[PDB]
Ligand code: HEM
């Protein structure tokens with residue numbers, strides 16, 4: 339494993355849809371997944387265009403192409419790699435499971451790519467459906483039209499944090515009413531709120547950086563993995579700034595439906611925004627450990643290295659935990 343890249347030496351706004359990074363359509367076999375950010379980076383060649391990359395490639399791409407901040411890039415990338423990537427080959431698919439990540443570790447590890455439900459990906463996504471409905475990764479036109487509708491009703495036609503606050507809650511209520519397996523606890527509880535800020539913070543041209551995303555740009559990223567022509571990245575590093583506005587609109591407790599629709603039951607063992615270090619500890623002690631309960635020597639070494647890297651991204655002042663000693 340390579341060391342996590344450091345922050346950008348020069349984090350100014352600049353043209354990122356440039357001659358060295360043209361958009362190209364998918365070739366047969368090219369993988370795209372539930373993340374429009376990574377999808378766009380792959381479709382512009384900031385990441386390998388086949389959608390399989392190393393963690394260091396992913397961190398460099400999100401920083402260079404979008405100005406995602408270093409700590410957020412490290413946390414998200416190593417969390418995804420630990421639960422969805424191949425720790426021996428250092429490869430992660432940004433979408434479906436593929437033999438391109440190499441020989442698989444033993445069960446119960448899945449190495450299922452970012453499409454794997456319940457590890458990183460989860461319910462109440464904005465433009466992707468819940469896994470229970472058949473497809474947790476492809477762009478959904480009905481769901482995007484609802485994002486456009488909420489942008490028209492709360493953002494004057496643009497997506498901003500006010501729209502994020504309303505749409506986030508709508509998608510939660512929709513999942514409670516229709517997905518008997520809806521889960522909204524721990525890691526997904528955090529990412530569901532965080533990801534609603536990214537279109538306002540990172541898909542808005544950095545020469546404006548006004549938090550107002552137009553629907554042409556929104557469709558370009560969410561559906562076609564394509565930067566607008568002449569797109570300038572954000573003018574400074576960021577990730578979740580403004581997530582407080584989304585939470586404040588409709589504060590929620592972590593929980594899940596319990597096998598039936600309209601059965602949302604709070605989980606008092608879940609972490610929440612008052613316990614960010616618990617989210618990290620449960621991710622390592624329960625999610626990662628459940629995939630790798632008794633690893634052999636080479637896997638244990640790779641796990642420990644990637645867990646050290648994950649810890650570098652932990653933003654709360656937290657204590658590191660060591661599931662393999
Ligand atoms: C740094 C590494 C990253 C990783 C590992 C990652 C991974 C993911 C995954 C697995 C999802 C699916 C969560 C869900 O079920 O909705 C997701 C969603 C999302 N990501 Fe990323 N991502 C990263 C960076 C970024 C960046 C840099 C951007 C923007 C420039 C971005 C924008 C988004 C958005 C907007 C969503 C929500 C999609 C939706 O709900 O319709 N991500 N990401």
Ligand SMILES: *[C@@H]1O[C@H](CO)[C@@H](O)[C@H](O)[C@H]1NC(C)=O
Pocket residue numbers: 467478479480481
């Ligand atoms: C998209 O989402 C809508 C609304 O949840 C759902 O009815 C539909 O089956 C999904 N799939 C496609 C391919 O549109």
Ligand SMILES: *[C@@H]1O[C@H](CO)[C@@H](O)[C@H](O)[C@H]1NC(C)=O
Pocket residue numbers: 492493494498499500501549
């Ligand atoms: C979103 O846009 C609406 C309409 O322009 C505005 O009232 C609201 O303050 C905006 N929210 C932001 C910028 O967070």
Ligand SMILES: *[C@@H]1O[C@H](CO)[C@@H](O)[C@H](O)[C@H]1NC(C)=O
Pocket residue numbers: 616619620623659660661
């Ligand atoms: C995680 O495991 C460590 C021991 O490795 C323990 O000290 C810590 O309390 C655990 N955290 C949880 C279960 O949240």
Ligand SMILES: [Mg+2]
Pocket residue numbers: 372459460461462463466467468474
């Ligand atoms: Mg999802």
